[PDB]
């Protein structure tokens, strides 16, 4: 149907906008702390601590399959990156501090992304 096509075009355009958002958020992680999944070979207990691991590469795979239906879903995964790190790592660590700085900086980006998603529809 044409209606199904129009919905698919909207999803495609959302995917475009979320790719630009993802790029901008990942630039706020110049250390690349959040680039890849935590390795279960290197942190064998991780899944005892963190139930839903998340990282920028895993987000990018979902994005490229057009797997985010709305900005809320994308934000959920970004918040998991931050929140997982702030739980597993202590306040005095480079990891935790990197997560705080990512959250603070990413807030700016996400605030305008929401306006754009609402504005363009």
Curated annotation (Swiss-Prot):
Top-level taxonomic group: Eukaryota
Record location of the Glycyl lysine isopeptide (Lys-Gly) (interchain with G-Cter in SUMO2) cross-link: 41
Localization per record: Nucleus; Chromosome
Tissue: Highly expressed in testis.
Every Bromo domain range: 9-113
Function according to Swiss-Prot or TrEMBL: Scaffold subunit of various histone acetyltransferase (HAT) complexes, such as the MOZ/MORF and HBO1 complexes, that acts as a regulator of hematopoiesis. Plays a key role in HBO1 complex by directing KAT7/HBO1 specificity towards histone H3 'Lys-14' acetylation (H3K14ac), thereby promoting erythroid differentiation.
Assembly notes: Component of some HBO1 complex composed of KAT7/HBO1, MEAF6, ING4 and BRD1/BRPF2. Component of the MOZ/MORF complex composed at least of ING5, KAT6A, KAT6B, MEAF6 and one of BRPF1, BRD1/BRPF2 and BRPF3. Interacts (via PHD-type zinc finger domain) with unmodified histone H3. Interacts (via PWWP domain) with dimethylated and trimethylated 'Lys-79' on histone H3.
Protein name from the UniProt record: Bromodomain-containing protein 1
């Amino acid at each position: 149907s044409m209606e199904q096509v129009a919905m698919e075009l909207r999803l495609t355009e959302l995917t475009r906008l979320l790719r630009s958002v993802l790029d901008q958020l990942q630039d706020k992680d110049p250390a690349r702390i959040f680039a890849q999944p935590v390795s279960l070979k290197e942190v064998p207990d991780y899944l005892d601590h963190i139930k839903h691991p998340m990282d920028f590469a895993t987000m990018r795979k979902r994005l490229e399959a057009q797997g985010y239906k709305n900005l809320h879903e994308f934000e959920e995964d970004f918040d998991l990156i931050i929140d997982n790190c702030m739980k597993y790592n202590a306040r005095d660590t480079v990891f935790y501090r990197a997560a705080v700085r990512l959250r603070d900086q990413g807030g700016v980006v996400l605030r305008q992304a929401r306006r754009e998603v609402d504005s363009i529809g």
